[PDB]
């Protein structure tokens, strides 16, 4: 078979396709256009963009396919180094931190970031609860400064202290720069161009900015049980060695960044479906009051959360806030018995298409309804994929569930929600995907922390 492959602009293939702020998005609609697989060339560049979980369920085999960096991971690897989420399978690295940090994920450790997670989660109520009448939320705004200081809080025993500032914290400020310039790169026809010596020079000026709070957690550190004891003191089982300095380092950064960006996304993109569907919201909030009883939450009343949790898994569904993953072939091979690969050849999975599978969801899938996730096992293998594949896949997914789970749950106990804007989607994409603008009223319940 030969694959269906977009509208091209001579020389220049489908490069001017991306040429737009929010490109996952365009390529969801050449998905809808062209169907299960379509061919994307760029100048001596090619992939192929799979949206069918048919397809995607034999990227998923970790023996024909493994991880990949996309364009766009290897430019955030300039500043993130080989840290996780930007290291080759096959780097000495990766397995060594994977194996050292894994730990830091455990049951144990999970029950272990409880109380911090309820030190922010009670910083960003008590801000709501102290807003005068007919104030506002701005959503994605307070979601950040609640994810980043739980990682924060958690992983490093550090304080951003995001609530005690009307704008973000430098990091992120420079963090979302960074990440716009790495990419921008992609579309730039001669990078080394004179013509973006001040963007090389901005770039290289966040990264510093970055990489001096990661050497102020590590000197706090050097004057707990958490992320960053692993990092410097974790040894390896397999190769029985500790991680080095530069690669800790890295690690820091990954963290902060992957740590906070999509769950803050997440959360917004759950309120956001809320208020579209009160229905769904009443229940919620009614599970809210049943199960949270006590005025701080323990961790065992955030796992009777169910209801909340299928909320979360929807949202997911809809607008997985880390909405692709890159794959190469591992040696040649035949995709779905019509679409011969080489060793090399790389693969995208456009996570929100594979999430709109009519064949696997039914045919309302634009619908917002958590029911879909009543029994989770219900779903097939590979066709919700919202934290990635196989061992490549998110270390940290059960740390941002406890914490969205405990933050929405805490938020529908304490206040009704208003959509007092009607606001209009509109997604914002970075690294990730949020709900840019938007905003909610909130009416205390009154109900004590
Ligand atoms: C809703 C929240 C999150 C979503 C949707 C999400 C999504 C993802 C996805 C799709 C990947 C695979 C990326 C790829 O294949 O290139 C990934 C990997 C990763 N994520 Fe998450 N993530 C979330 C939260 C977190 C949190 C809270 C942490 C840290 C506490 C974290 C740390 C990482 C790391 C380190 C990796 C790379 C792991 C490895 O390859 O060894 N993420 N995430």
Same mark, same amino acid.
């Given at each position: 078979?030969?694959?269906?492959?977009?509208?091209?602009?001579?020389?220049?293939?489908?490069?001017?396709?991306l040429?737009?702020?929010?490109?996952?998005?365009?390529?969801?609609?050449?998905?809808?256009?062209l169907?299960?697989?379509?061919?994307?060339?760029?100048p001596?560049?090619?992939?192929?963009?799979?949206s069918?979980?048919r397809?995607?369920?034999?990227?998923?085999?970790?023996?024909?396919?493994?991880?990949?960096?996309?364009?766009?991971?290897?430019?955030?690897?300039?500043?993130?180094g080989?840290?996780?989420?930007?290291?080759?399978?096959?780097?000495?690295?990766?397995?060594?931190?994977?194996?050292?940090?894994?730990?830091?994920?455990?049951?144990?450790?999970?029950?272990?970031?409880?109380?911090?997670?309820?030190?922010?989660?009670?910083?960003?109520?008590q801000?709501?609860?102290?807003?005068?009448?007919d104030?506002?939320?701005?959503?994605?705004?307070?979601?950040?400064?609640?994810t980043?200081?739980?990682?924060?809080?958690?992983?490093?025993?550090?304080?951003?202290?995001?609530?005690?500032?009307?704008?973000?914290?430098?990091?992120?400020?420079?963090?979302?720069?960074?990440?716009?310039?790495?990419?921008?790169?992609?579309?730039r026809?001669?990078?080394?161009?004179?013509?973006?010596?001040?963007?090389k020079?901005?770039?290289?000026?966040?990264?510093?900015?970055?990489?001096?709070?990661?050497?102020?957690?590590?000197?706090?550190?050097?004057?707990?049980?958490?992320?960053?004891?692993?990092?410097?003191?974790?040894?390896?089982?397999?190769?029985?060695?500790?991680?080095?300095?530069? #690669?800790?380092?890295?690690?820091? +950064?990954?963290?902060?960044? !992957?740590? $906070? /960006? @999509?769950t803050?996304? *997440?959360?917004?993109?759950?309120?956001?479906?809320?208020?579209?569907?009160?229905?769904?919201?009443?229940?919620?909030?009614?599970?809210?009051?049943?199960?949270?009883?006590?005025?701080?939450?323990?961790?065992?009343?955030?796992?009777?959360?169910?209801?909340?949790?299928?909320?979360?898994?929807?949202?997911?569904?809809?607008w997985?806030?880390?909405?692709?993953?890159?794959?190469?072939?591992?040696?040649?091979?035949?995709?779905?018995?019509?679409?011969?690969?080489?060793?090399?050849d790389?693969?995208?999975?456009?996570?929100?298409?594979?999430?709109?599978?009519?064949?696997?969801?039914?045919?309302?899938?634009?619908?917002?309804?958590?029911?879909?996730?009543?029994?989770?096992?219900?779903?097939?293998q590979?066709?919700?994929?919202?934290?990635? #594949?196989?061992?490549?896949?998110? +270390?940290?997914?059960?740390? !941002?569930? $406890? /914490? @969205?789970?405990?933050? *929405?749950?805490?938020?529908?106990?304490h206040?009704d929600?208003?959509?007092?804007?009607?606001?209009?989607?509109?997604?914002?994409?970075?690294?990730?995907?949020?709900?840019?603008?938007?905003?909610?009223?909130?009416?205390?319940?009154?109900?004590?922390?």
């Amino acid at each position: 078979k030969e694959m269906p492959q977009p509208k091209t602009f001579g020389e220049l293939k489908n490069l001017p396709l991306l040429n737009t702020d929010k490109p996952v998005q365009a390529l969801m609609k050449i998905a809808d256009e062209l169907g299960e697989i379509f061919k994307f060339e760029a100048p001596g560049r090619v992939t192929r963009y799979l949206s069918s979980q048919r397809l995607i369920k034999e990227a998923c085999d970790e023996s024909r396919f493994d991880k990949n960096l996309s364009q766009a991971l290897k430019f955030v690897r300039d500043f993130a180094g080989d840290g996780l989420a930007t290291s080759w399978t096959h780097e000495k690295n990766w397995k060594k931190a994977h194996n050292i940090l894994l730990p830091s994920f455990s049951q144990q450790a999970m029950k272990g970031y409880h109380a911090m997670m309820v030190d922010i989660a009670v910083q960003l109520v008590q801000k709501w609860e102290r807003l005068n009448a007919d104030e506002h939320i701005e959503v994605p705004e307070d979601m950040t400064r609640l994810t980043l200081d739980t990682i924060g809080l958690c992983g490093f025993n550090y304080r951003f202290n995001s609530f005690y500032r009307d704008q973000p914290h430098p990091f992120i400020t420079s963090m979302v720069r960074a990440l716009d310039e790495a990419m921008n790169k992609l579309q730039r026809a001669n990078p080394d161009d004179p013509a973006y010596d001040e963007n090389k020079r901005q770039f290289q000026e966040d990264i510093k900015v970055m990489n001096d709070l990661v050497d102020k957690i590590i000197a706090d550190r050097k004057a707990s049980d958490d992320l960053l004891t692993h990092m410097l003191n974790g040894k390896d089982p397999e190769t029985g060695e500790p991680l080095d300095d530069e #690669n800790i380092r890295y690690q820091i +950064i990954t963290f902060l960044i !992957a740590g $906070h /960006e @999509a769950t803050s996304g *997440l959360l917004s993109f759950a309120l956001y479906f809320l208020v579209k569907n009160p229905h769904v919201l009443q229940k919620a909030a009614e599970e809210a009051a049943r199960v949270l009883v006590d005025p701080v939450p323990s961790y065992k009343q955030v796992k009777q959360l169910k209801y909340v949790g299928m909320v979360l898994n929807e949202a997911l569904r809809l607008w997985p806030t880390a909405p692709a993953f890159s794959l190469y072939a591992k040696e040649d091979t035949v995709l779905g018995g019509e679409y011969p690969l080489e060793k090399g050849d790389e693969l995208m999975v456009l996570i929100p298409q594979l999430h709109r599978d009519k064949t696997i969801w039914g045919d309302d899938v634009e619908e917002f309804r958590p029911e879909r996730f009543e029994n989770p096992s219900a779903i097939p293998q590979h066709a919700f994929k919202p934290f990635g #594949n196989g061992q490549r896949a998110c +270390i940290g997914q059960q740390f !941002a569930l $406890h /914490e @969205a789970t405990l933050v *929405l749950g805490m938020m529908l106990k304490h206040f009704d929600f208003e959509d007092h804007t009607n606001y209009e989607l509109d997604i914002k994409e970075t690294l990730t995907l949020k709900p840019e603008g938007f905003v909610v009223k909130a009416k205390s319940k009154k109900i004590p922390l």
